[PDB]
Amino acid sequence: ERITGINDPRLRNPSDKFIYATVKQSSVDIYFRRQVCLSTMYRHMEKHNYESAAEAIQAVRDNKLHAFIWDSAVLEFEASQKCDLVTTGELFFRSGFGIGMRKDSPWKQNVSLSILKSHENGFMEDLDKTWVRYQEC
């Protein structure tokens, strides 16, 4: 077993057997940098970070990269779409993908309401079911 979960000793103890990687200049990378008791994971990132998510996915698919820490939804969709891959670890860091605007942007509030409208209209999961989670390998 490579990683049985967040408490897996391999996740806790870095080693050269696995190559943990994340996209360079990413929010997950900064979170790991600020994550206490895991500065070893930050060093593993610094010495093994992947320049992009696509290259990390390709390396994991053909076994260059032993593990790629990545957001649940996107990684799960990629694994389902391209198959030949699996995802481990539950949603140990629940978060959301939203919008970012300039400070005190008047339109952002409206956008927030629009976000709720999408949650009312299902447009997000509408596009999901349209072209995300049905053409699985």
Binding site: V23, S26, Y31, M101, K108, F123, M124
Partner: protein
Amino acid sequence: IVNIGAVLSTRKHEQMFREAVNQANKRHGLNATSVTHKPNAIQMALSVCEDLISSQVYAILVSHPPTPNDHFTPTPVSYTAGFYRIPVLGLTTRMSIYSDKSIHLSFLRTVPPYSHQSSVWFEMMRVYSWNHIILLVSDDHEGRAAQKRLETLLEERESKAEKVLQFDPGTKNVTALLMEAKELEARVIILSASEDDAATVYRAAAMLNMTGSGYVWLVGEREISGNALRYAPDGILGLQLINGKNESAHISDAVGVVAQAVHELLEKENDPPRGCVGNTNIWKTGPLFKRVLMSSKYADGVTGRVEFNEDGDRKFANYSIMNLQNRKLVQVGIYNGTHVIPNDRKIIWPGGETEKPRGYQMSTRLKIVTIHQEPFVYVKPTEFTVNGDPVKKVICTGPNDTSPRHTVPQCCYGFCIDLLIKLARTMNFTYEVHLVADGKFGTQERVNNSNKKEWNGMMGELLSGQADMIVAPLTINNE
């Protein structure tokens, strides 16, 4: 007996100044003299040195002569006073370089400089709460001082201006900066420049639709003068000194202040040097006189109380806010020290707006930078859905081919694309979609040749204002 002198070429204000100082000596709490403004600056310096050699002047009084000589007149006497650290005062010194303590520390301005005029402008902003302010100030030392004072005051108010425009004096084709700032969301423009520069910038603005609705400019006293008033669009706000160019009132106030200063000095138990010739060393009592002048102040003068600041400049001085109504600077407000008073509510804006236009200018060209994330942003170099519906693969340029740097438009379609097109259909906002060349989200990284950590990537561009907002699978983080 105290030997004092003044500089003025009117040849008639000398007698009234002598009468005023004699009356102040008789009432408040000593011989006085007057010097004509010599035409040549070197001649003026020679005359002031001769007068100091003959008479041990304790403090000089200087005002701009009626003939316009710009800043040439007060420099030699100010330098002479500062050579021996003699604390002297001026009357018409509206420039902030004299207020600086670098070289002209021995000069006390009875009137606030032009830079201080910017301060009430922020209060002017607080009058109408138009935070969308831009600066169009000439690249001058006084202009730079006014700009930095305004920047400090807005930083204290935590209201960042839209931008700043710098124009070298005497230069033409100033329309470049005017056009580069016209597209911004700011509707109110703050300007301060010389009379010729002011006239040039007003003509340039009137040349290309910069005086219409949503356009308004407030300027200092030096800008509202000469033919620039003729070239000034109607309704342009201006600020003027409460006392104006009234030499008699300033002379009386200075006489009272000098009487108070000498009354305080007479209590000191411990003289000017042996003139400009011979006694090269400065007087040890000069710094003491300057310190006691800083400690002392003038109260209830001809123009009201005149309380000098740490630099010897009158604080909370009143001003008149004028509006160019019917091509005249009609009385529309009074800046009483620090409080605005709308005496006449008949303000007509330059764009013919009777009401107060909002400082924000509506913008619809929403620029959206994005990052290529296949689940969210499908990008294909330059089709229908499963159900046959068309795919909204809009044109998106910005990727420099392989990150030799060939920016090429491509087709974009995905989750973020669907969300943004849904929004654009929702609140009817136009969009310009582009990608980012670095291909990274960004982070606070202390990059090479940098002092601190700077945000990079899409968030860095958004902070820099490259794009109006970021539409990407971005993780919410408080950083």
